[PDB]
Amino acid sequence: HWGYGKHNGPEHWHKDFPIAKGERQSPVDIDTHTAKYDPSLKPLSVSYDQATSLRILNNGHAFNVEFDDSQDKAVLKGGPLDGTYRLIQFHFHWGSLDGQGSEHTVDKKKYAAELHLVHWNTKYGDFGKAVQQPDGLAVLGIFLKVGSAKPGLQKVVDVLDSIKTKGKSADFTNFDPRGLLPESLDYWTYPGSLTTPPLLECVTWIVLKEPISVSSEQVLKFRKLNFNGEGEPEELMVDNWRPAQPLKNRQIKASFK
Ligand SMILES: NS(=O)(=O)c1ccc(NC(=O)Cc2ccccc2)cc1
Ligand SMILES: [Zn+2]
């Protein structure tokens, strides 16, 4: 099965998922000097006040904090988007070292980690239908650098002991994802894909310019998770990122000058 190792990692994915070599794959390098300001972009609207988190799951590739997406409770709108996109889960990608771990890069710079807040377009009724549409998903990407702690991340860090291995879940209610956002909502946007198999070309990417800072102790706790199941040989869940893919016939737009 696919993963992030030498024998099943990103260079192999195309054999089971030929769209890996498609026309709108993610992540990409964001060349800041080549992105163009688009004055018609609207400000983002992040409306997370009624968010209902339910559960945290180690799925063997990352950990997901899942939300109740059966009503408009935590939604993303505006920016490049038409319509209302409901938050279904967030997760991270991270490195074995502070010098790598993000999926997107900025002028070839890699961050220590990257947060993905995954949303789907309510016009398609459910997530499984949305991933089959070119405008089905909107993923809000936020870079993490190592420095000061992010207080709003700590509740996530402290539950990780309970979901160390693949297939473990834990109750995770009343978590407020607003505590994971930076001050500014300035962003870059482009059309792309899921960054893991099945690599579907269904995502409007919205990547914030301002990173959040997390502490060394916080990211070290991410690196204690396991890709394996309980009772299987231990392999640390680190370097669960896909490298930058060719931009091809796309322009990255910026919301700011
Ligand atoms: N790293 S990312 O945010 O691009 C990203 C976000 C989500 C997924 N996968 C699913 O959510 C699972 C699924 C896929 C297809 C159909 C039903 C379920 C992979 C990558
Ligand atoms: Zn992701």
From Swiss-Prot:
Optimum pH is 6-8. It catalyses: hydrogencarbonate + H(+) = CO2 + H2O; urea = cyanamide + H2O. It comes from Homo sapiens. The gene is CA2. This is Carbonic anhydrase 2. Changing residue 4 to F: Enhanced activity. Activated by X-ray, histamine, L-adrenaline, L- and D-phenylalanine, L- and D-histidine, L-His-OMe and beta-Ala-His (carnosine). Residues 1-256 form the Alpha-carbonic anhydrase domain. Target of drugs used in treatments against glaucoma disorder and breast cancer. Catalyzes the reversible hydration of carbon dioxide. Can also hydrate cyanamide to urea. Stimulates the chloride-bicarbonate exchange activity of SLC26A6. Essential for bone resorption and osteoclast differentiation. Involved in the regulation of fluid secretion into the anterior chamber of the eye. Contributes to intracellular pH regulation in the duodenal upper villous epithelium during proton-coupled peptide absorption. Changing residue 116 to D/N/Q: Reduced activity. GO terms for molecular function: arylesterase activity; carbonate dehydratase activity; cyanamide hydratase activity; zinc ion binding. The record marks 4, 59, 64 as: Fine-tunes the proton-transfer properties of H-64.
